[PDB]
Amino acid sequence: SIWSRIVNFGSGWGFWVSPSLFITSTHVIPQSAKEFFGVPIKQIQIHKSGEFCRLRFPKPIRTDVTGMILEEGAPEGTVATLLIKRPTGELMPLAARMGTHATMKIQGRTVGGQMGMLLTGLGTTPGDCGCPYIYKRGNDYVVIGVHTAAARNTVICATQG
Amino acid sequence: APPSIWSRIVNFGSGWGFWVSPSLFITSTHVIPQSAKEFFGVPIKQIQIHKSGEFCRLRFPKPIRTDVTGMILEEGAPEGTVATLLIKRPTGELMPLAARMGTHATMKIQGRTVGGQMGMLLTGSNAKSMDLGTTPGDCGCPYIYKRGNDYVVIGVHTAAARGGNTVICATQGSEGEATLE
C-alpha cells in the first residue's frame, strides 16, 4: 500500500507524498508532456531544487492516500530503504546506509542530496530514478528524497532544498 | 529476477513451491496439502517425495512444466552470500527480498527439528517494523543467487523472527525428519 504511491512517471517513477504532492527526480520528467495526471502542466506548481522535483497539484489527485512526513535526507548512518519498482511488476525494497549530505556536479548538473551505500554490497538500474528513499522513525514513515544516480554500491538520493 | 524465474513459483498447499526443472518441484514441508491424493495431477504413490526436515523435493516421473529450463540446486550457499528471496503474495505482488545468507545450523521451531541456513533481510533497518519482510503464507518461496552467469537455488523459506531481519531457509540435506522417496 506504500507501494501504491509509487507511479511510473516519464523515464522513471515518482511518489505521492500526499493527495496533492508528488515528488520525482527532475531528469526523468517527460519533456514533451502537456499534462501530468490529467492536469495541464501550467496549472501545477513545479519546483525544481537540482534533481529533487516537487509537483503540487491545484486539487487533490490521489485522495486515497494520507499525507506522509517529507524531510531533507536523514541522519548520517540511518539505514533507509529505497523502494524500487520495476516495469515487470516487481517491488524491490533495498536497504541503504545513508552518508554525507552534499551538493555535487553529476553529468554537468548540480545535484543536492545525500550519498548512500546499498547493503547488498540487487541494485539500481536505468529506469529506477524517482523512486523514494524512506525510513521508519518511531511509528512514523519518513520520506527523505528520490533516487537520482549510482556508481556503475554508491547511490545518490536527491533531497529537497 | 527474470519473469521465467517468477513463473516457476506457484501456490501449493498453505504456501508456495518452485519448479527447479520441468520434473522437480521444491517446497517447505509444513505447507504441503495433507491427505492429498495427487500433486499436479500425479498420484502421490507415483512421485519421489524427498524430505530433509522442512525442505521437500518432489520429483515427477515425466516432465510437468516443460516451459522451464533446469536450474542448479545447491545445499544453501557460502556464508555471506547475498541471495534473493522471491516472495509472491496472493494479492498479486512480486517481491524480491535481498538477504545475506549466514550460518548453517539446525533450529527447534514449534517443537520440530528444522535444519537450514539463517539469513538476514537487507530490505530495511527492521523489515518487520516496516512491512518489508515475510509473513504467514510465504513459506516455500525460493532463495536464489547468481554465480557468474548461472542462477542457483539454495532452499525454501520456512520461518522468520517476529521482529527484525532474521529468516530461515530450509535446505536440501539439512537436519530433521527425512524421507528418501
Alpha-carbon dihedral sign for residues B153, B155, B156, B160: negative
Q: Are A16 and A7 in contact (CB under 8 A)?
A: yes
Q: Residue B142 burial by CB count (10 A; 0-12/13-18/19+): exposed, middle or buried? A: buried
- Contact with chain A for residue B84, Cβ under 8 A: yes
- Contact with chain B for residue A4, Cβ under 8 A: no
**B101: distance to nearest CA of chain A, Å?**
11
Provide the 3-class DSSP secondary structure of residue B53: coil
Nearest CA in chain B to A80: B124
What domains can you pick out in chain A, each with its CATH number? 3-56 (2.40.10.10), 69-158 (2.40.10.10)
Beta bridge partners of residue B45, listed in sequence order:
none
- Contact with chain A for residue B124, Cβ under 8 A: yes
Residue B82 to residue B96: CA distance in whole angstroms? 12
Strands A52-56 and A69-70: unpaired
Say if the Cβ atoms of B98 and A88 lie within 8 Å: no
The per-residue b/e assignment along B95-132, b for 16 or more CB within 10 angstroms, e otherwise, is bbbbbbbbebeebebeeeebbbbbbbbbbbbebbebeb
Say if the Cβ atoms of A136 and B124 lie within 8 Å: yes
Cell numbers 519448479: residue? B19
* Residues 6+ positions from B99 with CB-CB distance below 8 Å: B82, B83, B84, B85, B119, B120, B121, B122, B143, B167, B169
- Contact with chain B for residue A47, Cβ under 8 A: no
Say if the Cβ atoms of A88 and B97 lie within 8 Å: no
Residue B28 to residue B180: CA distance in whole angstroms? 16
Q: Are A85 and A4 in contact (CB under 8 A)?
A: no
Strands A35-36 and A79-85: unpaired
Provide the 3-class DSSP secondary structure of residue B35: coil
Q: What is the DSSP letter of B29?
A: G
Alpha-carbon dihedral sign for residues B69, B75, B77, B82: positive
Q: Distances from the Cα of A132 to the Cαs of A48, B11, B128, B173, in angstroms?
A: 16, 31, 19, 41
- Cell readout for A138 is 518511531
Reduce the secondary structure of chain A to three states and give it as a string: CCHHHEEEECCEEEEEEECCEEEEEHHHCCCCCCEECCEEHHHCEEEEECCEEEEECCCCCCCCCCCCEECCCCCCCCEEEEEEECCCCEEEEEEEEEEEEEEEEECCEEEEEEEEEECCCCCCCCCCCCCEEEEEECCEEEEEEEEEEECCCEEEEECCC
Strands A140-150 and A69-70: parallel
Say if the Cβ atoms of B129 and A122 lie within 8 Å: no
Residue A115 to residue A97: CA distance in whole angstroms? 9
Give the experimental resolution in Å: 1.5
- Cell readout for A31 is 519533456
Q: What is the DSSP letter of B31?
A: G
Among B84, B100, B132, beta carbon nearest to A81: B132
Measured between its terminal Cα atoms, the distance across chain A in Å is 28
Q: Are B151 and B18 in contact (CB under 8 A)?
A: no
- Contact with chain A for residue B181, Cβ under 8 A: no
Tell me, yes or no, if A129 is annotated catalytic.
yes
Among A80, A89, A94, beta carbon nearest to B98: A94
